[PDB]
């Protein structure tokens, strides 16, 4: 089915022809348009008072990256390199070797935050919930180099944001 958006024949009776004459000379349809912007003047605006008020987000939000630990404090990351393989932007760089004990752990874990597209494939790919995108979106920097995160920066992010991150995973993991 279709409909016509603009296929009208206007009435030619005297009343309709005078109603259009008054509209042309008295600008009635232009005054009607003033009424609508007047009605907005007296509405409450939609502005929020940033940074005192914040735009609503959900637990799924994809923000700054972090590397997480188990409750014991051991790193979750096992240097499987699945996040590095799936990264659409090739933003992750990883090196690994046996730790001083026998553990399989990374020696390099970099994210070029200026290559990253914040797509979240890395946290989907991770089998142990080690790499996540956190809820933080207020980390703009004065230099480019400050956005090339090494493993120390990402572990600090996890230690900094774990309290919020764990609660967000708790809200969403049954959808995953």
């Amino acid at each position: 089915t279709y409909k016509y958006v603009n296929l009208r024949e206007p009435s030619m009776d005297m009343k309709s022809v005078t109603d259009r004459a008054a509209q042309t000379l008295l600008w009635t349809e232009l005054i009607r348009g003033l009424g609508m912007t007047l009605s907005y003047l007296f509405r409450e605006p939609a502005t929020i008072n940033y940074p005192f008020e914040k735009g609503p987000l959900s637990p799924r939000f994809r923000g700054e990256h972090a590397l997480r630990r188990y409750p014991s404090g051991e790193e979750r990351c096992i240097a499987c390199k699945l996040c590095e393989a799936v990264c659409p932007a090739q933003a992750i760089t990883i090196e690994a070797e046996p730790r001083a004990d026998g553990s399989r752990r990374t020696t390099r874990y970099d994210i070029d935050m200026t290559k990253c597209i914040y797509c979240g494939f890395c946290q989907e790919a991770c089998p142990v919930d080690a790499i996540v995108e956190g809820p933080n979106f207020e980390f703009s920097t004065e230099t480019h180099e400050e956005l090339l995160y090494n493993k120390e920066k990402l572990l600090n992010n996890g230690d900094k944001w774990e309290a919020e991150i764990a609660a967000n995973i708790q809200a969403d993991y049954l959808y995953r």
Binding site: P45, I117, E142, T143, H144
Partner: protein, 155 residues
């Protein structure tokens, strides 16, 4: 005391410059949509004194909002150079920050800091409108820290 006077005069000019930032009407790709959302009613950048103006002659800030190609690079440099001083650049999003997801492309400049100096780097693909607004406020605080007249005084 000259020290006290120049200290106060920096506050005056710094306050004027950060309170009346006029970005160039300049956007390149996806990230320009989030910039439009920062002008929209929810965030209303204009309420901070941030007003878009098209002419580079009447602009204080270039927000590089999107991918910079090699074909567009001379044009971006041209309009930056035509800004009167003082002028600032905000790099918005992964593309402008360091090439992003077209980083290895033959036609893409790997970061707009190869072409212009950059004051603030706003991460995201795209950064949320609020993330950009955070970047603009970070630029305001940077301008608030400028010590032009104090440095002139001690020359």
């Amino acid at each position: 005391r000259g020290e006290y006077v120049v200290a106060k005069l920096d506050d005056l000019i710094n306050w004027a410059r950060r309170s009346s930032l006029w970005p160039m009407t300049f956007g390149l790709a996806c990230c320009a949509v989030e910039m439009m959302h920062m002008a929209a009613p929810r965030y209303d950048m204009d309420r901070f004194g941030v007003v878009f103006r098209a002419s580079p002659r009447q602009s204080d800030v270039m927000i590089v909002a999107g991918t910079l190609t090699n074909k567009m690079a001379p044009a971006l440099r041209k309009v930056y150079d035509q800004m009167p001083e003082p002028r600032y650049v905000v790099s918005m999003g992964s593309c402008a920050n360091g090439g992003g997801y077209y980083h290895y492309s033959y036609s893409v400049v790997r970061g707009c800091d190869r072409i212009v100096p950059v004051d603030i780097y706003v991460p995201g693909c795209p950064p949320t409108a609020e993330a950009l607004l955070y970047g603009i406020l970070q630029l305001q605080k940077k301008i608030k820290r400028e010590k032009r007249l104090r440095i002139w005084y001690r020359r």
